[PDB]
Amino acid sequence: ALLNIFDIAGSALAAQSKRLNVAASNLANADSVTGPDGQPYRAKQVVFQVDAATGGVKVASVIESQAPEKLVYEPGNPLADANGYVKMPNVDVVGEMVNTMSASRSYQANIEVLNTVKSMMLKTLTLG
Amino acid sequence: ATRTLVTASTPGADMTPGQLDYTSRPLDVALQQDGWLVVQAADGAEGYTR
């Protein structure tokens, strides 16, 4: 089926957009010290899966990465624990700087796939 | 939910007492660790300073 390409590439576009938004949010919150209720910011990631044989890619869910918080010592802070160690986001920088580029490249590649498929479908529309 | 916007905030000042000059002027005072001189603001209400 050549119609399924549209909702395969749309799924790919949506998944890559979600991944790029997650990476941008992590980069923005790379240094945020607290949330709305004292909960430290946690790096988040998306889960990709196949639609199903094989099909498009769907984002199953968004999960906070389970890594120890890079806690720092600020005793004169209300959020400090009993030992004065406040918790900071466990977000690197190279990871997101590469995730953005990879997501953009995949997005552009799927755009090219959709363009080619649409062109050949329109060409087939005038058989004979 | 994926977007988490960022805003800046200032959780008040810091009360660490800075160092002090010895100007020898007879009417120059310095407070203790948690002292405050009480003055009268422009609107009549009181305020605390160092």
Binding site: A14, P36, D37 | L5, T7
Partner: peptide, 21 residues
């Protein structure tokens, strides 16, 4: 329910409070 589908119920507004009251 699944994202991208059609439902006759409009989504509730999205809000981002700074601090929980």
């Amino acid at each position: 329910g699944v994202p991208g589908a059609l439902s006759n119920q409009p989504a509730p507004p999205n809000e981002a409070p700074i601090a929980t009251p």
